[PDB]
Design a protein around this ligand. Structure first.
Ligand SMILES: [Ca+2]
Ligand SMILES: [Ca+2]
Ligand SMILES: [Ca+2]
Ligand SMILES: [Ca+2]
Lengths: 662, 662
């Protein structure tokens, strides 16, 4: 009948408990369409409605703002708002568009005629924030089966008669008891967070084919060993993150087998997406990986009210890494965030999203962050494939301009699914020293694949193989200190101690000064210190610094006053500038009332806030923040669509952020 | 399993009988994909194949040209070529991509696992050409029920007791006998082509709900009256075009009723797209307009081997206007062109495509042209809604850069579906004089809605209504010479006699000199004459001509030597420049061999051709055409992917066209 298209286009994509949410819908129709409607919910119930009559939830109308006729087809634009909701509230809504004095309705995105087969949109109403510990976190991503074998008695599926090509895709015996033993070495490395490979009872050594969402495979140990590991890692002030697989199970899961035999008389038939011809929804056509239907009400309750608290509340994990966060819906992640952030708002929830950064942005407001694949892709091509250092800068610059400031991009060089950096760099550890150094001097949360610090690479070429190319990314950790690259280990320990002792290197603004191919200098702003980083992977060259200032090589406690500097060949260093920068003492507000309004500092947060100013609706305000009667923030703007007593907040780390928070 | 995407991306989109056709396929996959394949056909049979084994047709492989891994997903590019085919050949092909040493296959665009549910691509192998008479054609689009009532005895469904609001959407009595009577008036207007509204036996007076594809509704007359009309219009050297409805029937069609009752035991059950729950494919949700399934083999044979020859061969129509050409597939139109162009290659086949010009371009090679909706949209907003004359120039310029030179864009101001121009221009006939003049001085084939020349407009406002807003675009033709706008008629007759007596105004190059808002001057190049057109819909102004040359107002046989000219207010004129331009006498070819190769003229066509030069495959040639040892075509390029003895052709109307035709 037409083409209703909403596509999650709600105006405040990350809504506060104050602002209303404007829903804009584009419709391409032949016959008439006159008005639509929103049928949104506040509890966890599924929303439904039709032609202005809501079945479960409240109603809000869609009204034609713009319309015309282009190439004999009529193009109208419908708009409506969802009323503001309280903090920590999951809003699910469905959208339809019909014609007054007509027969029927048509829903959003799916163009369905009924609410049941329509797209279910959702967002989470909350002052969006990520755990502050996750911003400063340095993560040691370990593959449990390939780390250490602290107990050979748990190696039930290990066949020692296998060759390396045959054992690397099978079980090798790494267990959670080994992570307990080598916990001193992990702590000596300097990391403050441990990311554990999946430990589900599955038929494969990687654990991504769960046959029990709430059970540890005996090949890795027991829950008590896991509880002992997490508790011992907690007594060292380290955090533990679990690699969580919510999208799919294996065909061997008791739920899938019971549904595969009993059919519709099975309690788990609707827990998967079975089709009317025997086919079922799967993960990329893998018949052994049926997609777990998290959009089913009784299955979404099992994942959220049974499985997730088992790992976060019972086993006391500190966070979850979500395998294939694209699988489940946004309406599931909105429910997921309300569940995990009600247990503890300091529980790190970041996902593995195989998509561009313009689509990873849609996960903001639901997840605390994601894995920076753009970091991976634009670091191999630069440091391992000899690229331009601009693609490094062109990556950092576009992260600031696209991602929400609270979104945490976890950066990495290797994966259990991607080739090792050392092997892609020809085992030239000088390039890995540059990448690991540049990473720990760039914004984000660095992740260290378990073997990288000792030179663990690939014992074979992956291009020579098929299907199981990922054998050689999951080789066993080397502990023989003769076979280890102790120079690389002492390098990783030193680049960690620097980042862990300089807040500007973790949560500081980024600014590039000069950069050529195989040459880059940049700075890391803050409010307590500044730093200058210089990295070159080619010949020696000179790069032009903006200002002129004395420096201090943090490694070799020297100094250097100059306007330029000659970065060495295949060398790198980070310099700390020395500035008696007068800290913030007074912040005023110029542009709202007749005279400047002096703000008051909040020591709990790090912001300056106004007192309580009334504003008229849709009134285009225009103002700025002055600093100690000297410099001033460039002019801002804001429209208070609903209410009056709105408050002005000034975060000096994000000064241009128009955060007129009620 | 992946995302195979071909999207009709064959390199020669309009293939000659000489060039091979390169098929490029983009695949976004997780697991491996190593090779694909093309399964193309030459006859009318449906193509099918799997994993290199073709079921109906020949096989051509798809090989990975490029590949990488981006954001943990692998992106490969498959390529293969379809061998060159003879002239007048319909190539249908299907495309799949699989993994060697894998299990199964996956097909193009639909991502289906079988060939039956895959996208069926097609193109037509032919030296693409549109009927030369259709390029110069001036069309008089009449709505048969609203023209003249030459026989009141055929008004079976006319209810004289109805009001105008109720009769304008019902039957009024216009018949083909009236078109016979008023044929002198149509010929006096000057048009050389008549476009007839649909005459199918349907339940509505517009005829777009056919209940008999090969039957004339008695409310319009008989076949003999239609045969008499077409024959009488032929004896006056006029052409007749039929408005053809191939996409859908009405629910009252005997085929649909028999299938609606007998079900799968009906011979026409597969002739529509019935769904397994009682729903059926329809035209924009209209349950009374079920979509006729032209992709069914037995239905495509009924349309092409029974219905189309009934109108083009039996009733001896000169062409078909195709209602909603987007409905049927491209694989249907490839069959459709092979059928109508085998009856007579001088049969005009142009379609009604409700889409952007970048998508109307895909109909080139299958249809002779289309209706220029961009002309309509960007002429109401300019001449009836007071816009910029640049949007007129920005429309003509983008037609040259996007459309194939043989594609014929039929321009119009009104439709039976769009509001009248006079009513959108506030009955200000001075604006309609400007639009009708500017139209007949612009490239394309002008179409005249039946009432426009006598000031026929709308007796009511369409915004006041719903569903049947198109009553007021289909009002009855006025014949009382007092109620007619004879000034507008004498205007249309004069702007026709000019275009019909100046070949540069029909098939001549377009060049804009100066243009402001409500002001425009341009020229129309050719090889026998040049013209200058000046149009202003605002106040008087002066526009800067490029060169300086004397002119001649074709209306008032005056002259004017100057470098600029002052176009009047709400006035317009077309001037013919006077130039003793030495015609083409010698054309040589500089760049292929060591010395210039003199070309020979072909009087049958209008081109200069080479003699027969051998070329190596993929050899980047670079050459030009010199004219009478004076000016030269700017350097061209060409690669002969297959063969040797290729010939060079020079069309002086399209000189930059690299037509190295074998
Ligand atoms: Ca996975
Ligand atoms: Ca695998
Ligand atoms: Ca129609
Ligand atoms: Ca209608």
């Amino acid at each position: 009948g037409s083409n209703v298209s909403h596509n999650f286009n709600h105006n405040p994509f990350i809504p506060s408990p104050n602002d209303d949410v404007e829903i804009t819908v584009e419709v391409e129709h032949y016959g008439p369409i006159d008005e639509g409607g929103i049928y949104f919910t506040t509890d966890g119930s599924t929303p439904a409605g039709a032609r202005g009559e809501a079945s479960s939830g409240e109603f809000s109308p869609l009204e034609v703002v713009e319309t015309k006729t282009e190439n004999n087809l009529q193009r109208s634009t419908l708009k409506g708002v969802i009323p503001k909701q309280a903090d920590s509230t999951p809003v699910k809504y469905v959208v339809d568009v019909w014609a007054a004095d007509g027969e029927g309705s048509q829903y959003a995105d799916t163009n369905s005629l009924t609410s049941a087969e329509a797209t279910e949109f959702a967002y989470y109403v909350e002052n969006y924030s990520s755990p502050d510990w996750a911003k400063d976190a340095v993560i040691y991503h370990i593959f449990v089966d390939r780390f250490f074998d602290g107990n050979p008695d748990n190696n039930f599926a290990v066949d020692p008669s296998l060759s390396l090509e045959e054992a690397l895709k099978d079980w090798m015996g790494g267990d959670l008891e080994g992570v307990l033993a080598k916990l001193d070495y992990i702590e000596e490395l300097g990391v403050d967070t441990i990311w554990l490979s999946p430990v589900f009872e599955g038929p494969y050594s990687h654990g991504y084919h769960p046959t029990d969402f709430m059970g540890v495979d005996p090949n890795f140990g027991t829950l008590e060993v896991l509880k002992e590991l997490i508790d011992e890692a907690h007594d060292r002030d380290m955090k533990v993150i679990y690699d969580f697989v919510p999208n799919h199970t294996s065909s061997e899961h008791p739920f899938f087998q019971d549904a595969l035999e009993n059919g519709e008389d099975s309690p788990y038939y609707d827990w998967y997406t079975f089709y009317e011809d025997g086919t079922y929804e799967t993960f990329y056509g893998i018949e052994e990986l049926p997609q777990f239907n998290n959009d089913h009400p009784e299955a979404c309750d099992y994942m959220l009210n049974e499985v997730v608290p088992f790992w976060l509340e019972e086993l006391e994990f500190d966070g979850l890494r979500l395998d294939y966060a694209k699988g489940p819906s946004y309406s599931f992640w909105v429910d997921f965030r309300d569940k995990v952030k009600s247990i503890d708002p300091d529980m790190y929830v970041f996902g593995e999203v195989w998509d561009s950064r313009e689509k990873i942005s849609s996960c903001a407001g639901k997840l605390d962050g994601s894995l920076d694949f753009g970091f991976h892709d634009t670091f191999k091509g630069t440091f391992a494939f000899d690229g331009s250092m601009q693609s490094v800068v062109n990556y950092v610059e576009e992260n600031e301009a696209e991602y929400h400031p609270e979104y945490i991009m976890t950066t990495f060089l290797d994966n259990h699914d991607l080739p090792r950096f050392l092997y892609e760099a020809g085992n030239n550890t000088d390039k890995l020293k540059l990448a690991s150094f540049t990473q720990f001097m760039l914004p984000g949360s660095p992740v260290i694949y378990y073997g990288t610090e000792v030179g663990l690479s690939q014992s074979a070429n992956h291009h020579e193989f098929n299907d199981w190319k990922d054998r050689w990314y999951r080789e066993f950790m080397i502990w023989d200190e003769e076979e280890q690259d102790r120079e690389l280990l002492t390098h990783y320990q030193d680049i960690i101690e620097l980042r862990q002792n300089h807040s500007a290197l973790r949560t500081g603004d980024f600014h590039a000064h000069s950069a050529t191919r195989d040459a880059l200098v940049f700075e890391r702003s803050n409010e307590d210190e500044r730093l200058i980083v210089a990295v070159n992977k080619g010949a020696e060259a000179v790069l032009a610094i903006d200002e002129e200032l004395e420096l201090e090589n943090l490694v070799t406690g020297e100094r250097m006053t100059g306007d330029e500097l000659t970065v060495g060949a295949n060398s790198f260093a980070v310099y700390q500038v020395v500035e008696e920068e007068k800290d913030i003492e007074h912040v005023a507000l110029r542009g709202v009332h007749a005279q400047d309004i002096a703000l008051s500092y909040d020591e709990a947060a790090g912001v300056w806030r106004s007192e309580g100013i009334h504003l008229k609706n849709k009134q285009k305000v225009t103002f700025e923040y002055v600093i100690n009667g000297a410099e001033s923030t460039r002019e801002l703007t804001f429209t208070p669509d609903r209410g009056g007593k709105f408050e002005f907040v000034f975060n000096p780390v994000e000064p241009e952020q128009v955060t007129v928070l009620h």
